[PDB]
Short mmCIF file of C-alpha atoms in Angstrom, two decimals:
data_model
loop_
_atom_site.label_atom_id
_atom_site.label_comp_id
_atom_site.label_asym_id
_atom_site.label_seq_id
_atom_site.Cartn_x
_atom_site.Cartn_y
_atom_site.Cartn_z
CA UNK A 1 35.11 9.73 -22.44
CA UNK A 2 31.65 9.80 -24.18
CA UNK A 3 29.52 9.65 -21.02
CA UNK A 4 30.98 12.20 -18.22
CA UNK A 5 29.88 12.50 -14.18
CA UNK A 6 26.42 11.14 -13.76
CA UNK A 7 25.24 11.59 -16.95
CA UNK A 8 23.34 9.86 -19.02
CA UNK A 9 21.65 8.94 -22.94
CA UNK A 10 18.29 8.35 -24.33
CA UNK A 11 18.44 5.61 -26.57
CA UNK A 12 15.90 3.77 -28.77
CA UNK A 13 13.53 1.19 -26.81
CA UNK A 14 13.69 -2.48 -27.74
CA UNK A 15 9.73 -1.71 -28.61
CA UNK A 16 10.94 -0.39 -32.11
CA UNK A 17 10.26 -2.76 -34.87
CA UNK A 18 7.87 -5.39 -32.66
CA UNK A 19 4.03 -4.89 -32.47
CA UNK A 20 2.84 -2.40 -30.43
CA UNK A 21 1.86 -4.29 -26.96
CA UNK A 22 -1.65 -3.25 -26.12
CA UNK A 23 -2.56 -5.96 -24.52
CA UNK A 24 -6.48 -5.59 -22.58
CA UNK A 25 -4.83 -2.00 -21.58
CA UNK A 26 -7.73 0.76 -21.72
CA UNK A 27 -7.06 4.97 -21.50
CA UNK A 28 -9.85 7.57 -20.81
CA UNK A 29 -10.13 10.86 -22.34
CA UNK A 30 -12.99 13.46 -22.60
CA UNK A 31 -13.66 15.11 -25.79
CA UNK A 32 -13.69 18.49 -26.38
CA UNK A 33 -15.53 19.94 -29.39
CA UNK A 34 -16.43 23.77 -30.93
CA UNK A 35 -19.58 22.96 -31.87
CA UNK A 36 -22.04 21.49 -29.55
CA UNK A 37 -19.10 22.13 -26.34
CA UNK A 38 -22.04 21.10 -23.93
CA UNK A 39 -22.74 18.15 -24.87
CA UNK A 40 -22.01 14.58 -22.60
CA UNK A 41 -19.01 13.68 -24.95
CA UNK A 42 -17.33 16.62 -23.89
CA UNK A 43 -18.27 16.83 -19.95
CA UNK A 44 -17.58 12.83 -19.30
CA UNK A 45 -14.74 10.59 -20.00
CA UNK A 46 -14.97 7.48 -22.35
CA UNK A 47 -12.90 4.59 -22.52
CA UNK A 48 -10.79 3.16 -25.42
CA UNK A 49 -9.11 -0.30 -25.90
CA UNK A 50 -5.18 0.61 -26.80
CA UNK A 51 -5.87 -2.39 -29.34
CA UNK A 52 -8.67 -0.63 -30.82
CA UNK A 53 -7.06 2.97 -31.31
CA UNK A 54 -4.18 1.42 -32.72
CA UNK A 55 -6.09 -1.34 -35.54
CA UNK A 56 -8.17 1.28 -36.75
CA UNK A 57 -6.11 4.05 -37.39
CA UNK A 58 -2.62 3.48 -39.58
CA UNK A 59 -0.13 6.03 -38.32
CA UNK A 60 -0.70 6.98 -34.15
CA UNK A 61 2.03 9.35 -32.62
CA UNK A 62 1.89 8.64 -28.69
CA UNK A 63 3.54 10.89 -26.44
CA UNK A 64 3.74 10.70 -22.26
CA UNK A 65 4.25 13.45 -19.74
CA UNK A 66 4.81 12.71 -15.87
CA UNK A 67 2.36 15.50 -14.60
CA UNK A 68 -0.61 18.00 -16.18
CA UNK A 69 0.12 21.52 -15.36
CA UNK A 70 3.91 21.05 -14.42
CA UNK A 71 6.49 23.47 -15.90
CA UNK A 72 8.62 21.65 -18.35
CA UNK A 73 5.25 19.70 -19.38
CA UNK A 74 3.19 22.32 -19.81
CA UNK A 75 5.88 24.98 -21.21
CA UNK A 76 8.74 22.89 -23.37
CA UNK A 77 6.87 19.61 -24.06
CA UNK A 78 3.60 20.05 -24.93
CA UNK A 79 2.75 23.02 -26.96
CA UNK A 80 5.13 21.54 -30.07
CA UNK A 81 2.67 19.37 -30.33
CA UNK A 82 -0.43 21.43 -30.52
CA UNK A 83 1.41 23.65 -32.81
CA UNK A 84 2.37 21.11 -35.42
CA UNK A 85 -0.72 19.19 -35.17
CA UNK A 86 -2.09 20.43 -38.27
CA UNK A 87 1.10 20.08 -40.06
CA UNK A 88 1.01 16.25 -38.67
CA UNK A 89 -2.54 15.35 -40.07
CA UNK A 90 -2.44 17.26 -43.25
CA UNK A 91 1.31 16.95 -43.97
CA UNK A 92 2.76 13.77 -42.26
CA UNK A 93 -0.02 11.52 -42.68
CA UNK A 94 -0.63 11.04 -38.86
CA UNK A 95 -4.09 10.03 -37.84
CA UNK A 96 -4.27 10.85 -34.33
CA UNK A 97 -1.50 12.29 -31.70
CA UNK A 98 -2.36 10.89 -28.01
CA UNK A 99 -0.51 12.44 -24.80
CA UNK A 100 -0.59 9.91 -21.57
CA UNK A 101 -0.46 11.07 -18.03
CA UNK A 102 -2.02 9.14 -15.36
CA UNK A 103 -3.94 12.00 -14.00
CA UNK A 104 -7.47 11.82 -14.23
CA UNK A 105 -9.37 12.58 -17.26
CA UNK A 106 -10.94 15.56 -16.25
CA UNK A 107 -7.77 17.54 -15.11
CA UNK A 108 -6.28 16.24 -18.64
CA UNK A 109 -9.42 17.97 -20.46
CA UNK A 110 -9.06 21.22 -18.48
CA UNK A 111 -5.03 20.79 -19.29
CA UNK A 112 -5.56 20.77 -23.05
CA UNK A 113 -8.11 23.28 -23.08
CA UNK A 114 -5.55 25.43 -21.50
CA UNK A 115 -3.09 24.37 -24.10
CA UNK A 116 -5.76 25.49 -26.48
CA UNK A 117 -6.67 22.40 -27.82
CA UNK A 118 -9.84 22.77 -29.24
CA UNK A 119 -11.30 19.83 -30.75
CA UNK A 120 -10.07 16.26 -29.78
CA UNK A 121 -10.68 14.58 -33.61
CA UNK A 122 -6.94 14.11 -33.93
CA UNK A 123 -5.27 14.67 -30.45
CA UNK A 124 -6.16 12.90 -27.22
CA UNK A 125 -5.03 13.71 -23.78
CA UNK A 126 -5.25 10.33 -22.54
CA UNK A 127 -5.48 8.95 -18.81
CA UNK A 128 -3.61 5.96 -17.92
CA UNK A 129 -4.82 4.96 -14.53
CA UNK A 130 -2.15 3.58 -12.27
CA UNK A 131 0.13 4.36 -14.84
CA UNK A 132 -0.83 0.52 -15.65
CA UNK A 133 0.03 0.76 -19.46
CA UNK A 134 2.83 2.96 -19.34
CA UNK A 135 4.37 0.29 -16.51
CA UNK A 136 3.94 -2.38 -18.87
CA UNK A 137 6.23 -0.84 -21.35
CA UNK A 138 9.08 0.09 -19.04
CA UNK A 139 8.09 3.58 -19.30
CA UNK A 140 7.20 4.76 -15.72
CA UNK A 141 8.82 7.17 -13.77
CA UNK A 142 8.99 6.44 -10.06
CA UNK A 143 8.02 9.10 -7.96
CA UNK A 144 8.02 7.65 -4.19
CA UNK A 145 5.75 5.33 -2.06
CA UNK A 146 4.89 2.94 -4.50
CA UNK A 147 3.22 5.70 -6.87
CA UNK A 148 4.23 6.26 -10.55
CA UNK A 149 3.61 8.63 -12.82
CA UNK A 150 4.70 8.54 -16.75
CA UNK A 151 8.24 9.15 -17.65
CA UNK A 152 8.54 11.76 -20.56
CA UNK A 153 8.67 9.68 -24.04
CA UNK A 154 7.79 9.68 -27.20
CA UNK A 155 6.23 6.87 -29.64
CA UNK A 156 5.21 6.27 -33.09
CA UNK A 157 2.84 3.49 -34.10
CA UNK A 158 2.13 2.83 -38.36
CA UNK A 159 0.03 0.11 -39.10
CA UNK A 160 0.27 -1.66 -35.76
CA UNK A 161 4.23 -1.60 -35.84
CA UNK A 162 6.40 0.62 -33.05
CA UNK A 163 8.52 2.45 -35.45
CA UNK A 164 9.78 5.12 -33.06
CA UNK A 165 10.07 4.42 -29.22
CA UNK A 166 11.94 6.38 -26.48
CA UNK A 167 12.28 8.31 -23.15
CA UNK A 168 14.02 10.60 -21.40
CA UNK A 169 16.60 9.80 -18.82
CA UNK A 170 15.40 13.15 -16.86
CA UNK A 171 12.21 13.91 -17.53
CA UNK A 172 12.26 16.12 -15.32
CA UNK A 173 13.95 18.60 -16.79
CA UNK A 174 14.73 16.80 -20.60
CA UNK A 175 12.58 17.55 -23.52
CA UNK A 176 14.67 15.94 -25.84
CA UNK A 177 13.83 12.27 -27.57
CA UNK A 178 9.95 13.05 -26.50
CA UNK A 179 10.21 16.18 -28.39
CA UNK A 180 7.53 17.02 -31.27
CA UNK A 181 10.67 17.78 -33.06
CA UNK A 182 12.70 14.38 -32.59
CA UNK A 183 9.13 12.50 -33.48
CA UNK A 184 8.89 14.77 -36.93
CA UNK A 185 12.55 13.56 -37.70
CA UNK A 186 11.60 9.70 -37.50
CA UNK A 187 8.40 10.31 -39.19
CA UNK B 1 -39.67 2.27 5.83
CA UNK B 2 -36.64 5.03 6.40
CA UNK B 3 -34.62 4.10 3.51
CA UNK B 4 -36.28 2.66 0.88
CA UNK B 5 -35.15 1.04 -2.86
CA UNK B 6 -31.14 1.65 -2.88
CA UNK B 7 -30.69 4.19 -1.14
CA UNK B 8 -28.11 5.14 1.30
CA UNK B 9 -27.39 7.75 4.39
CA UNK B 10 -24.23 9.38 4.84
CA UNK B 11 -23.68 8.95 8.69
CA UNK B 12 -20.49 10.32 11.40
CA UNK B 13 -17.50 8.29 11.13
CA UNK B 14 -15.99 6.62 14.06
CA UNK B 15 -13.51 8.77 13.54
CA UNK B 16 -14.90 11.16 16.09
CA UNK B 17 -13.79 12.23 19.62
CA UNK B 18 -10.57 10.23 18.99
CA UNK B 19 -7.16 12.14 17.95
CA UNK B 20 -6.53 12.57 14.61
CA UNK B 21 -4.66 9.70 13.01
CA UNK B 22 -1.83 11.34 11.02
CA UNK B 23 0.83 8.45 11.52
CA UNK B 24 3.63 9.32 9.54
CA UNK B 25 1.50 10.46 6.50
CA UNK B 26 2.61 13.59 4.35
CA UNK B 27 0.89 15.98 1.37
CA UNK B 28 2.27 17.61 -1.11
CA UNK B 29 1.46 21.47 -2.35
CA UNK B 30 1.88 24.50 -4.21
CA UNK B 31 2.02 27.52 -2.08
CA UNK B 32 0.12 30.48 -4.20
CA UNK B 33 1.13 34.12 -3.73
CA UNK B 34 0.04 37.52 -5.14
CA UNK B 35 3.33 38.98 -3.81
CA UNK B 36 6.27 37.57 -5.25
CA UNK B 37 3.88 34.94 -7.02
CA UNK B 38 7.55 33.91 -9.42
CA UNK B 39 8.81 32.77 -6.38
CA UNK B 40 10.24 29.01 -6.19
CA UNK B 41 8.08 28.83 -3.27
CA UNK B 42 5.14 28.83 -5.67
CA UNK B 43 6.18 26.90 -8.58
CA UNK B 44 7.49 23.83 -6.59
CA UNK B 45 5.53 21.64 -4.07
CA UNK B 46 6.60 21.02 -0.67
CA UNK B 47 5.91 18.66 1.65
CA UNK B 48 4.03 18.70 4.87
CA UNK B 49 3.84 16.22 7.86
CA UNK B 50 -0.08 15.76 8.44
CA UNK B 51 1.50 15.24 12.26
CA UNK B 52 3.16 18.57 11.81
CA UNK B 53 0.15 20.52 10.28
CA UNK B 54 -2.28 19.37 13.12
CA UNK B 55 0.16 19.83 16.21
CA UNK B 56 0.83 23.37 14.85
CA UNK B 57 -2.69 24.65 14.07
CA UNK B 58 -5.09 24.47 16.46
CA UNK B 59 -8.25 24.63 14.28
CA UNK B 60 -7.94 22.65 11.38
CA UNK B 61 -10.55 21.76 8.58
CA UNK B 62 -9.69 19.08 5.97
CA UNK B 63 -12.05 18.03 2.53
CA UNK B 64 -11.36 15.13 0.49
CA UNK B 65 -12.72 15.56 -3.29
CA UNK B 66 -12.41 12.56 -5.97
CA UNK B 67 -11.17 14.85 -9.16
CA UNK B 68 -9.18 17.83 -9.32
CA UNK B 69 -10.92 19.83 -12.12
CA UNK B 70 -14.28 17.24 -12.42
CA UNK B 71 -17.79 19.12 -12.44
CA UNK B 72 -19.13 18.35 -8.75
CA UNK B 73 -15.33 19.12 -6.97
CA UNK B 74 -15.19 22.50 -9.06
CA UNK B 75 -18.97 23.87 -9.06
CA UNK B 76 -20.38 22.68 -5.90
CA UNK B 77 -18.24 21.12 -3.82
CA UNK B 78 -14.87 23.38 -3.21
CA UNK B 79 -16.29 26.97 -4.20
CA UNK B 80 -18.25 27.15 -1.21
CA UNK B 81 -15.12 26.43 0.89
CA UNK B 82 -13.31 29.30 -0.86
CA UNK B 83 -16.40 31.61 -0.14
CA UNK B 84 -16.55 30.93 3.00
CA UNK B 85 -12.78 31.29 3.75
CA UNK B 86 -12.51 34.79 5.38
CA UNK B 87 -15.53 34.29 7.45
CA UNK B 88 -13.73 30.70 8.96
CA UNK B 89 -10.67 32.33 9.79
CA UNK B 90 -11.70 35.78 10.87
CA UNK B 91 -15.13 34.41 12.59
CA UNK B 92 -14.77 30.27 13.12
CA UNK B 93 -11.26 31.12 14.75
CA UNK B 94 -10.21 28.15 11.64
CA UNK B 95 -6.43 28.03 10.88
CA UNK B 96 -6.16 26.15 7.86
CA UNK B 97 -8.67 24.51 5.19
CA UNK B 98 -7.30 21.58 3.13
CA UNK B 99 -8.28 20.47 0.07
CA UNK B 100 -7.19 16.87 -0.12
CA UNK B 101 -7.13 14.77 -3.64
CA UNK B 102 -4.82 12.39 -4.91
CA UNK B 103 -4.17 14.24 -7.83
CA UNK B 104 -0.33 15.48 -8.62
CA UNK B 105 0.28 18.94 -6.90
CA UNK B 106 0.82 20.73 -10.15
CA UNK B 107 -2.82 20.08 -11.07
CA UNK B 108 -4.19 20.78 -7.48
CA UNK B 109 -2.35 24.38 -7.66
CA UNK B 110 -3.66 25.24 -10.69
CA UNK B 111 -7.38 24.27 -10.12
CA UNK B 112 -6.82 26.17 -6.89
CA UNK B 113 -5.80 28.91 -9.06
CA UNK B 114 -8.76 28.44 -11.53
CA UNK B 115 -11.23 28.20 -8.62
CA UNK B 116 -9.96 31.68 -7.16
CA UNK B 117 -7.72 31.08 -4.90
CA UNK B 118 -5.06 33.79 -4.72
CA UNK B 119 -3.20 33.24 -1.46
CA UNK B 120 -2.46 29.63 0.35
CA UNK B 121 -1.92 31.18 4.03
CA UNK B 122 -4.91 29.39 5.44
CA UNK B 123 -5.93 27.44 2.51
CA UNK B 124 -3.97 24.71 0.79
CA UNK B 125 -4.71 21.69 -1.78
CA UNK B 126 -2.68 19.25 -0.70
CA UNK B 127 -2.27 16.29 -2.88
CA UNK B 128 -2.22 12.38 -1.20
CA UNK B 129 -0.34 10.51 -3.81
CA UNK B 130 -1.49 7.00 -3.84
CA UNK B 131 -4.51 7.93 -1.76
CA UNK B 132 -2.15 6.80 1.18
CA UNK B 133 -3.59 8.79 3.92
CA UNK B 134 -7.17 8.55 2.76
CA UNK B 135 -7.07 5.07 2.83
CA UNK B 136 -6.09 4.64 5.91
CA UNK B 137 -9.21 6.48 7.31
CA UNK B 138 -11.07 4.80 5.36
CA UNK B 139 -12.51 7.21 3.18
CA UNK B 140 -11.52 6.31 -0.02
CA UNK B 141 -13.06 6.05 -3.37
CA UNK B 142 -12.26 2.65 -5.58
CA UNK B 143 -12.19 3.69 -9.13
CA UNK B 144 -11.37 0.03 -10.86
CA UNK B 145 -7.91 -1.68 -11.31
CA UNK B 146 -6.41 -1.28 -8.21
CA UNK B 147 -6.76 2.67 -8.04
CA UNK B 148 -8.46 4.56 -5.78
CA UNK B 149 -9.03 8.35 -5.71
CA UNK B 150 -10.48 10.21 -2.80
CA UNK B 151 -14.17 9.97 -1.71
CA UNK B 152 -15.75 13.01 -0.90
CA UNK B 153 -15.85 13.95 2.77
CA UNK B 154 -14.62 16.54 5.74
CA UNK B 155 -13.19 16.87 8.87
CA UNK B 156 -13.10 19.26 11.68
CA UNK B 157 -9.75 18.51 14.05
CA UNK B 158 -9.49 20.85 16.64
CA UNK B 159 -6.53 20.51 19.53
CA UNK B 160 -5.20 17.66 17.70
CA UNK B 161 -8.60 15.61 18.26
CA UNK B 162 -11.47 14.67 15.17
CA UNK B 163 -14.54 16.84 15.95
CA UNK B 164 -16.52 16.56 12.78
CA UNK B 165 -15.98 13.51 10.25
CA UNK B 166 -18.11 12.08 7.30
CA UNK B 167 -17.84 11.35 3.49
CA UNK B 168 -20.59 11.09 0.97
CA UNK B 169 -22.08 7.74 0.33
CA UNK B 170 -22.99 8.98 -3.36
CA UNK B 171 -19.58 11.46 -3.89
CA UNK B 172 -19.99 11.71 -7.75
CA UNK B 173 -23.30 13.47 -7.06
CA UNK B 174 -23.60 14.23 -3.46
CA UNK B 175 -22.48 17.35 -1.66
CA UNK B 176 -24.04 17.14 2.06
CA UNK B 177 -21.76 16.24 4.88
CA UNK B 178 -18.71 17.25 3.09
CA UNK B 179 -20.39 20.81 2.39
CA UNK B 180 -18.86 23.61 3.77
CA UNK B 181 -22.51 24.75 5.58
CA UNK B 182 -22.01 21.13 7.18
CA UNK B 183 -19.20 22.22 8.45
CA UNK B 184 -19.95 25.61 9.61
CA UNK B 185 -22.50 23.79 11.69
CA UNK B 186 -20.68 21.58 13.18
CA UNK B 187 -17.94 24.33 14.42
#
């Protein structure tokens, strides 16, 4: 048959086509800059309304990853990103690219600096405390205990509308439907 | 009068001269190597009974920090630990030093890493997902929404009993009783 032993798809989330559901949800990131790299913006987080991020800018790529500084996060999933991100902005139209994890926002700074991110204009690492947001979309990944970190998944957001929306079935291991590459294809 | 306008004093925790409460709590970590530093043993976390660790070590000491990678944690508060590391095991008679934060263990190993650390044979940053342990001592930091990293504080447990046991009342700023020359003094 089409589906073997314990295996499974990634298919398209129900979110595609609906308005993007940001609710009062609320991420923190710190900003990192080349010029003036000591400044507050870039030493402490700031807070920004989901609602906000998404009315005033028309075309938002939004991808999550379970853990900063795990292998297939750090190594597979990732650095596509960073590597087409000027392609994205200058090419594709995209206004900003923002990558959850519900670490906190200081360990996601030092994580994209290490991914040589070095200015945050157009890419985010974003903290989603509690993984609140990322629960609300049916997006989590269950790790034990009652804790949850982000599943591995991919979004795209123009003009307020989900266009793209989907996760990995083993995020684990899976860079597939979260890829940079899968999100460039429904772009 | 002895504390005036706001102000607060970090004092002992009850804690003391009872046996350490380790329930059925467990940590996560990364073991870090400079021989065979590919090894699985050092890319993937294991877990550890706090029960376990304490019966087994006779000398234990045990910080909590709030932020893996956030500017008091990594410049004042852990360094000194690291510094101080040979002189606690070869001097102190200490058997292990842990580095508690709720962060995911992937993030704790490589701050670890960033801070210096190059072998986890007496040291280890042990990650508390959920803040479940910490919490249940009591010395935990609420962050807003229901999340709660940990406070800053440390511990001396020797023969299975809490020696030494206080956390910051100011942990964003503070670095007293959790210091490391705190602790020295009160070995």
């Amino acid at each position: 048959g089409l589906v073997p032993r314990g295996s499974h798809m990634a298919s398209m989330s129900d979110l595609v086509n609906k308005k993007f559901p940001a609710g009062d949800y609320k991420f923190q990131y710190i900003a990192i800059s080349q010029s003036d790299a000591d400044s507050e913006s870039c030493k402490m987080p700031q807070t920004v309304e989901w609602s906000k991020l998404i009315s005033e800018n028309k075309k938002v790529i939004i991808t999550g990853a379970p853990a900063a500084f795990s292998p297939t996060c750090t190594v597979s999933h990732i650095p596509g990103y960073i590597n087409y991100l000027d392609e994205l902005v200058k090419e594709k139209e995209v206004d900003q690219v923002i990558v959850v994890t519900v670490d906190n926002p200081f360990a996601n700074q030092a994580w994209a600096k290490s991914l040589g991110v070095k200015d945050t204009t157009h890419i985010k690492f974003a903290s989603d405390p509690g993984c609140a947001f990322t629960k609300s979309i049916g997006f989590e990944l269950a790790v034990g205990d009652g804790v949850y970190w982000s599943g591995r998944w991919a979004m795209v957001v123009e003009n307020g509308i989900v266009t793209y929306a989907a996760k990995e079935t083993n995020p684990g291991t899976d860079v597939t439907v979260s890829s940079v590459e899968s999100v460039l294809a429904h772009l």
